[PDB]
């Protein structure tokens, strides 16, 4: 069936890099971020994975909406935990037409 271009064994070591599973009413995906990571920081991550502006994405854990200044560890998230996300989908546009250029070698 579905295939995945993968050419690398288990990941290297890390500090407090924990895994967080995002449960959405449309799909679910696992993410990898440090417990110190903030809620707002994750949004910018799930925004591309789910294709939804981080200004709508809503995280829910322990029956309480995670706070920006509340890191994954502050909310109660850990390596192997899940979080039911809910996209408000309050955006009617396709971003902003502009050249997306990146940095050079280095």
Residue 76 belongs to domain with CATH number: 3.10.20.90
Give the SS3 label for residue 48.
helix
List the end-to-end C-alpha distance of the chain, in Å, as a whole number: 38
User: Tokens in use for 61?
Assistant: 């854990």
**Which residues does residue 34 pair with via DSSP β-bridges, in sequence order?**
17
* φ and ψ of 40, to 5 deg: -60, -35
Could you tell me whether strands 28-34 and 17-23 are parallel, antiparallel, or unpaired per DSSP bridges?
antiparallel
Which of these, 40, 48, 64, 55, lies nearest to 90 by C-alpha position? 55
Range of the domain at 77: 17-87
């Amino acid at each position: 069936g579905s295939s995945g271009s993968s050419g690398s064994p288990a990941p290297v070591q890390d500090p407090h890099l924990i895994k967080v599973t995002v449960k959405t009413p449309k799909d679910k995906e696992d993410f990898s971020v440090t417990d110190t990571c903030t809620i707002q920081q994750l949004k910018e991550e799930i925004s591309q994975r789910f294709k939804a502006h981080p200004d709508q994405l809503v995280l829910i854990f322990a029956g309480k909406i995670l706070k920006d200044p509340d890191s994954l560890a502050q909310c109660g998230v850990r390596d192997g935990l899940t979080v039911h996300l809910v996209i408000k989908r309050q955006h009617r546009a396709m971003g902003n037409e502009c050249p997306a250029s990146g940095p050079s070698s280095g």
